A paper describes a structure:
The [name] enzyme is active as a 234 kDa hexamer consisting of three dimers. It was reported that [name] cleaves both single- and double-stranded RNA at uridine sites producing 2′,3′-cyclic phosphodiester and 5′-hydroxyl termini. To evade host pattern recognition receptor MDA5 responsible for activating the host defenses, the [name] cleaves the 5′-polyuridine tracts in (-) sense viral RNAs, which are the product of polyA-templated RNA synthesis. In addition to biochemical data, we report five new structures of the enzyme in complex with 5′UMP, 3′UMP, 5′GpU, uridine 2′3′-vanadate (UV)—a transition state analog, and Tipiracil—a uracil derivative.
The structure of the complex with UV was determined at 2.25 Å resolution. UV binds to the uridine binding site as observed in the structures with 5′UMP, GpU, and Tipiracil. The uracil moiety is recognized by Ser294 and Leu346 defining the uracil recognition and interacts also with Tyr343. One oxygen (O2′) atom below the plane is interacting with His250 and the other oxygen above the plane is in contact with His235. The vanadate position is consistent with 3′-phosphoryl group that is cleaved in the RNA substrate and observed in the GpU and Tipiracil complexes. The vanadate interacts with key catalytic site residues including His250, His235, Lys290, Thr341, Gly247 and has several water-mediated interactions. Particularly, Lys290 makes hydrogen bonds to O2′ and one of the vanadate oxygen atoms in the plane reminiscent of Lys41 in RNase A. These interactions confirm previous experimental observations for [name] and are consistent with the proposed SN2 mechanism. The structure also provides insights into the structure of 2′,3′-cyclic phosphodiester, which is the product of transphosphorylation reaction. This structure suggests that [name] should follow a two-step reaction mechanism with the final product being 3′UMP. The [name] mechanism of catalysis is consistent with that of RNase A as observed in the structure of the complex with UV transition state.
Residue numbers in the entry:
A (entry chain A), B (entry chain A), C (entry chain A), D (entry chain B), E (entry chain B): 0 to 346
Amino acid sequence: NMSLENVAFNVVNKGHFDGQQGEVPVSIINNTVYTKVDGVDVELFENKTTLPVNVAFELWAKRNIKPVPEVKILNNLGVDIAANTVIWDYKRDAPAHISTIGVCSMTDIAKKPTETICAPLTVFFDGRVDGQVDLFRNARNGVLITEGSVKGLQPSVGPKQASLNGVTLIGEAVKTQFNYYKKVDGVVQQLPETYFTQSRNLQEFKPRSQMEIDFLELAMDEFIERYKLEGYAFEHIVYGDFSHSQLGGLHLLIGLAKRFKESPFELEDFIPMDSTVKNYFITDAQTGSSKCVCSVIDLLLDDFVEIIKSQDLSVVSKVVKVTIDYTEISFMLWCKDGHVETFYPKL
Amino acid sequence: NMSLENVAFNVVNKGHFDGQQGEVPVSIINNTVYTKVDGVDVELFENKTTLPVNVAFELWAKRNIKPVPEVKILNNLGVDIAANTVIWDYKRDAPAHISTIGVCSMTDIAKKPTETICAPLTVFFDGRVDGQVDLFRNARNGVLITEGSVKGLQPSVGPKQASLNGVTLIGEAVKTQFNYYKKVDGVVQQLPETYFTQSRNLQEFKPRSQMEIDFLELAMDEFIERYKLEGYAFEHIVYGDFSHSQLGGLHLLIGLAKRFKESPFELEDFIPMDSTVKNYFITDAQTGSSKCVCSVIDLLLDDFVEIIKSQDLSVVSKVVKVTIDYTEISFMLWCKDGHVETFYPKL
Amino acid sequence: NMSLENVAFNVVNKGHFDGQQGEVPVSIINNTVYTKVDGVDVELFENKTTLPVNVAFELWAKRNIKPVPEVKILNNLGVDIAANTVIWDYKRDAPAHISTIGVCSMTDIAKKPTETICAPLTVFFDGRVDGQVDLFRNARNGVLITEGSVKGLQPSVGPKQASLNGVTLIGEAVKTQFNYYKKVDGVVQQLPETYFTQSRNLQEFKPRSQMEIDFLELAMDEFIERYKLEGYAFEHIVYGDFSHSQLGGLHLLIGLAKRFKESPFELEDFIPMDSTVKNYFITDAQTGSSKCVCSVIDLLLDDFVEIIKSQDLSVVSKVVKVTIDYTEISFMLWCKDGHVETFYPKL
Amino acid sequence: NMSLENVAFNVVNKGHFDGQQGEVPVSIINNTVYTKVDGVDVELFENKTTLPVNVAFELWAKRNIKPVPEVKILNNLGVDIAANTVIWDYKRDAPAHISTIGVCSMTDIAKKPTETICAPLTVFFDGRVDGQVDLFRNARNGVLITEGSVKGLQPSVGPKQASLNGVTLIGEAVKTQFNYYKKVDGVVQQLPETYFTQSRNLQEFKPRSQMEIDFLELAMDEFIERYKLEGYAFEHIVYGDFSHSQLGGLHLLIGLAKRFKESPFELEDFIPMDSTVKNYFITDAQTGSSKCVCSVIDLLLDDFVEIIKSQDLSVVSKVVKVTIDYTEISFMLWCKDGHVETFYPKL
Amino acid sequence: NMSLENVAFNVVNKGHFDGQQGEVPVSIINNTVYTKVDGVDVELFENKTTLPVNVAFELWAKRNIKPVPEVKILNNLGVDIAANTVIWDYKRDAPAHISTIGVCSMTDIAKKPTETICAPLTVFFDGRVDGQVDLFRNARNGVLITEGSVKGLQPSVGPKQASLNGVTLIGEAVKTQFNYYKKVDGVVQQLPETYFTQSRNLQEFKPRSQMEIDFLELAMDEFIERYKLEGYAFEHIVYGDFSHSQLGGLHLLIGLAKRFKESPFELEDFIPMDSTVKNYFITDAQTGSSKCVCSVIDLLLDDFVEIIKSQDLSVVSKVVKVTIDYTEISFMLWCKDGHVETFYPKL
């Protein structure tokens, strides 16, 4: 059954744990796993987790290598544990959940989710696995994803992108958009209307709408003129203000990407994890403008336009709730004389 | 007052220590600081210093987040300690000074620089902080920086660039050029005439003079012809010689940048720190030419021209002293028959 | 003689160990070596090996800084130890061999290869060093490299590239192609006909033949038409198939380089070492196609064409042996109705 | 500087650092220093300090092997650093002082005490070493020990015992009683008329007076009668109360020794260091009585009798300062109806 | 190879590795091996060796639990490695040998001693195991122990005592006296006529002869009289001098045992390993006499009397070679006027 040397055999021969028989010699020094190859030791894994090195090594080998939802999605849905699989958080380089079910003896709380210890927990079920749809039908609290329809259950469509081996992508040779289902205390839940973040990054940013194409290809004055955005303070919120010591606005990722192609800047991710809203310590190299906590979100520009245009601007300041990635994101809206001053999210 | 959990609260909520009240749960494993977020541990800080992890974590959170002089400047001025702040050396990923004054209990030698323990040390004072100019007037040995004039003190103007959160830049939304002052044994010192290095890097090198623009845009034969530099061995010193096994010359950073755009090469910084002269183990990928110790300095090309043209060339070899970044840099000048052979600095 | 502080003196002053006299203060914390510079500690070396930090630090300082064969070459020839030098494996960031001869007291099994302990081992000799050719003539088992001819020994010509300080290159200011010789049990061996891998990488890939230039500059249909490669399944083997969940083929490095310029992808080197065949866990960002174990080899495209055209295609599946880098590489050849289906190597 | 391997050579060949020349192979793993003895590694030093392993090993090797004052004596005199020697704290298994003077390059703030940086520090001088008395006269702050009189210096006779290699004892083949002198800001200070602790331990404990001899053999009631100790709470202060959950009194070490021979108990030294007054968490194995903080001190019984009998019993609670080991010890004095209730020291 | 979890299973269920099948959950943290016992982690092995934690744990589990020779015996015979077993050095808490033969894949240089790589190594064979005597005949270098005679092999009778699980004793329910044989380069060597050390320790010490019985009960003067030891410096060599600062003589263990019962003292084993002659840094608790290097050996008193009485006292200083534990021990012999002054062993 279980064996450290057998786990390393699979990694060496199959790139991951594939249930194959065999053993290779291993050495444990510090938080690193080595193996002997022609008389020399070769590093296989460096433990960046809070778990023992041999345990964390086992879970990483048994990680899910299929398209899975991003961890922030699972977090916003309150997933506590997965059923007979391991979700690897590549943002944290660690397992997404503390315990396991029928995966690793050191972390297993149960062999099956049918066991009594799993009832209060929100177990994640994968409909692509045989028998897991019915396990969800018998689970007290759980979350389920499927590719197609499910009889007797009104689905909730997720985002276009999913994580495959740490790579977030919109699948073309594989399906990445799932139907979502959730039960709480044996009662199926009606998932709310939500926006979805795009999970893009600066180095490889690509526009996904004609408005996003126009935003990047055109100038600030023309873009505001084309889409009639006067009074909404896009210069501050999206384009960002760099004239002063403290950086102004710059809360949309597409705004950061437009600047990065022309002027570099430093982003310090002082909370390195997968979350819908990301906070950064930013310093602009060209001007010297900086801000300690700059909340950034990767919303589609069209969706962001709809949100800010759907608000009341008669109050100097108030808190705005927006359901994004199935979680309720709080926004700070500042207005003066019927026009927007700033509008930023909070974590 | 002090608290590890309170320090992490500020980092999580404010990106740094901002004196706010609150606590978050933390874990110390190896040289890393974690915190719990929705039941999982998230890395906040990895100790790359020789100090205890919790102490180094505290100093990094309390680091100075305003434009500060680069560490090499402070080193050349003999700064031993800073007054009620922490200068973070991003080149070393560690505090620039061993002890502190009124910052961290574990490293504090004093609460104020007025205390008797601070008299022999060269304390760094920031004139932008209230009351620190007069503290410098009462300090026995110290260094002071200001933005404007100071009554009764003849200032010394520093370089255009300063470090902001590890980013060296010439500020446009903030001031980065300061006036410099120094006292030794209660006696104000007259700072010497000095050149200043430019603190640029290869990936983002930008010319800062028409001569530098001509150097990068033109060829070697034309550049020497335009600025009449025959007999000074710029082909060796600046452009570099790659025909032989040992690399020849290549001691100016602008020379490295011109090559890097056309041919890649490997630079091994065997002394990773902030210093006016940087020594590298270089290996040219295209040709195979290499040199163990290649001293490199980032001087403005015009300033470098003035220096080498201001020397006597009648001796085969001698040592040349040049005041750069307020420190006296030794150069090796080799000549033959009234013409320069090579001219390189030493660390 | 030997001294930790003296070794660090050479590194600081000469970039490596140069047998110079002097000492500097050092600190050992975790797997890292520091030294004091103006009262602060500066990191000199981080031990990424399975050896003690001070020992590994000594061997790294005494590493060979001349053009040396790549480790995979030495591995395929069965080199167990080097004579009075240290070969540093930059792929593993560790010594290429466990023990040493006359280098470090902690790892020395002998002072000279003439000693009785060295007879069974395959000792690597460098003909560029004085007296090492005759030592090879007296060694029982050994490997030798030279630049020119050797009297009484029929040479075997190696590859054009060699490793210089971790930089694999074809030397232009230095010679990188050597003559190879090997003795087993006092008997000179006749080295077999072998192909050689090119040791290129994706970021800096350059074609080395007109066929390689045509492969990158032209389309798939035209390239197959120009070089008449119908029925050999280059679309699968070289260009790669991304239409399905599992990635198809893509076993030649030049195929990866052509894709990388247009579409990015993730390569996970789960066995980080120098080997003729490299296995990767690949995930294509654009399509989502992936494969756990994708064997890749960097053969010249012309050589690869010659190999696959020199095979019999009448069997559904068989194992093909090819001598590459002096080792016998096993290939899997799949055919159907006289045409190639796939052809990939194994490690 | 110097050589780590040379330090290890002296240890194996001289038991300590004797300045002899020679070197041996050394391995540094974890916080442990090993050496190769005929192929196998032998542990030489387990670093239990807060300093780097190689540094602390050098300081432990250079520890003072002559009879030296106990660390509690030096601390009570405000000693900050030693002159050209290392005082080893065996009860902490660590150096008694942070920095050094002319001992170890890593910890040296100076090579000689006359250096300007040593002025504000109370430097410890050993008069038994040549030139150290004159260095004391030059020093601004310092403490001096001698075996005889110094010209014009008013001596302070210290305790009979001293520490020889972690062993506290009255020297018979050596002199363990010294004259003590102290300077504060260039001014000699008269040391106070003080008591001294006996520095005995629990398991090996010998009485040093007829009263102490009587205390161990006489019953509680008959001992109080012979020495007229009615109304002084000796039963509580010295004998101890075990009838209640919180342990009553028991603050003299000789009282602990008398009980330990009769009944065992546990002592938790939650502050493991050498100090005049020691605090212990004590649990009695027979009764179950316990106290979280029990202040204990090893005074001669005759001294404690003389001390407690010179007090005024007309106050309900009084703070009493007593000079012991050159420092003021504060006592709590509870009385009722002209009789002592309890009288315990405080740390 | 095999399984780390299987090794831990045998330890908890058999006290050691018994080859049984089964597995238990294991955690590796620091250099400690834990296992889960009803939810909690129980420490199983603290790695005190220079090998990886998992490797050393496997070797300790596979240690030889039969009576084996003491490590000082094997070292004195030049034993480099063991045949299909592990000898545990309990005085080092580490394997007695670096590599293994058919024991652990990580440390195995070979599976069987007949392999060609084991030829230049002195392999230890246990004649009590089937086939090991024949493997000794095939071996080029080796050492063999047996309980009885071997055909045609001239035996060497070893000491009465052996080590059973770190316990040295004379076997009563087992045989601890073996015949010893040795081969050097295929040639059997006659082992020298030797003495043997008694391998007793200080706290638990029993005399083994009437002379030793008399030594412990008789006074110094009356014991020398009964055994006619005038002019042989027994008072210095065996009894020891405490009147001076440097400790005089004291080189026989039975002399140490006689003093320890009367007065305690400290022994610093600065080279903690098993060897025929042990060096200690000694400090006497009563007098204060001390010596940095005090050579001690545990010989029977009758043997030492026989040895010292067969010497020639007509030389001021002489080096004396004595065969003890199959190795030559060098002695310093100082004499004056035909009388012994001191006679101490050297390590």
